[PDB]
Amino acid sequence: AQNPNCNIMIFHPTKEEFNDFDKYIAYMESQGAHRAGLAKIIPPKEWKARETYDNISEILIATPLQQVASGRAGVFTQYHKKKKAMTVGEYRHLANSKKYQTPPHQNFEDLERKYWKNRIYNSPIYGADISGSLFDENTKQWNLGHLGTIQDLLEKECGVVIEGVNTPYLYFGMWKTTFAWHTEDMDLYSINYLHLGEPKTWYVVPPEHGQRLERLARELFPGSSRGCGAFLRHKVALISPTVLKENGIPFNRITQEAGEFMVTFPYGYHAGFNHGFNCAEAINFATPRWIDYGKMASQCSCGEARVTFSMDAFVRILQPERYDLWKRGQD
Numbered sequence: 001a002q003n004p005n006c007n008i009m010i011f012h013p014t015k016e017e018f019n020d021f022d023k024y025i026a027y028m029e030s031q032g033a034h035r036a037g038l039a040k041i042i043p044p045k046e047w048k049a050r051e052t053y054d055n056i057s058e059i060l061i062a063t064p065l066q067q068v069a070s071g072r073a074g075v076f077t078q079y080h081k082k083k084k085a086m087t088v089g090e091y092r093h094l095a096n097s098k099k100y101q102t103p104p105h106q107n108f109e110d111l112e113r114k115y116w117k118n119r120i121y122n123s124p125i126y127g128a129d130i131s132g133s134l135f136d137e138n139t140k141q142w143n144l145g146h147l148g149t150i151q152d153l154l155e156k157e158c159g160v161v162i163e164g165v166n167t168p169y170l171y172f173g174m175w176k177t178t179f180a181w182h183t184e185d186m187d188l189y190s191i192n193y194l195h196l197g198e199p200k201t202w203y204v205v206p207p208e209h210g211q212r213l214e215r216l217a218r219e220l221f222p223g224s225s226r227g228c229g230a231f232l233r234h235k236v237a238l239i240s241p242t243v244l245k246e247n248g249i250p251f252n253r254i255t256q257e258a259g260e261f262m263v264t265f266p267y268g269y270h271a272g273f274n275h276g277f278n279c280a281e282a283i284n285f286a287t288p289r290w291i292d293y294g295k296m297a298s299q300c301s302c303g304e305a306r307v308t309f310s311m312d313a314f315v316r317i318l319q320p321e322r323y324d325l326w327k328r329g330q331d
């Protein structure tokens, strides 16, 4: 078995290997990359996402989210308070202000220590989940707005034609902005490109050990667990690496820098934080190996998780028994 310790793997494709996205994903899996839950892909030196980022300041963040924490430093939840709209230029200035800017630090490890020590005492503002793309239309390789769609994959594998669309999302971050422990909708893959700015640190649990994380989360968040049998679908809970180590949960960590791709694999729980002002783009995707994970994915039916139009069909076709109850949650 390849990669039996489930380490995060880093890949350096050539320009020729960068042509066929599906084929390269399948290559990475042949080397065991999926066992970690997360892989890094450094694009060939000839490649670029677009020519410059000089003209992005007028993009609107219609609903910036203030991420307010509750709990203890290593075990907390966050809720998202909606703020007034602002442009990317206005948000960048805010991220760079004395109130919100990255503190002085020695290296990524020192900054990680400061994040876990101090996150809860601040409420950074995240421009998340903004439909759109910063890939130039002429970028033909690994252009996250030109991938094969999940609906077309399901049709190719299973023969059933379904409604729905699949488009990318932009994330504008600042110091301490945080993504809670989750897997993707329907335990899909994700791909994330860091277009610009400061780094993003990731934590990941191997898919084969995901239920260990879930059992810890039920212990650490006991009211949430009674409220919903899949409450990590709410995307609100944080657990630090120190707490994970104390409870014997297998995980790995890595820092993504500007110009790099990350791929999360089906049922790979991940969480993380931004180091400072940045912009990422991400989308879900599927391969043939996903189908079995989609059929087994947990679902939130309590009403909290509320998701896209396009998840309807996936539930309806892959999980017909769950469909009725899940749809009641969505309505």
Ligand SMILES: O=C(O)CNC(=O)C(=O)O
Pocket (backbone or CB within 6 Å): 171, 178, 179, 190, 191, 192, 264, 270, 280, 282, 283
């Ligand atoms: O970058 C973020 O805030 C969160 N992104 C993801 O969870 C992802 O790409 O799967």
Ligand SMILES: [Mg+2]
Pocket (backbone or CB within 6 Å): 055, 056, 057, 058, 059
């Ligand atoms: Mg603009």
Ligand code: NI
Pocket (backbone or CB within 6 Å): 182, 183, 184, 190, 264, 270
């Ligand atoms: Ni994700």
Ligand SMILES: [Zn+2]
Pocket (backbone or CB within 6 Å): 227, 228, 229, 230, 231, 233, 234, 300, 301, 302, 303, 304, 305
């Ligand atoms: Zn729920």
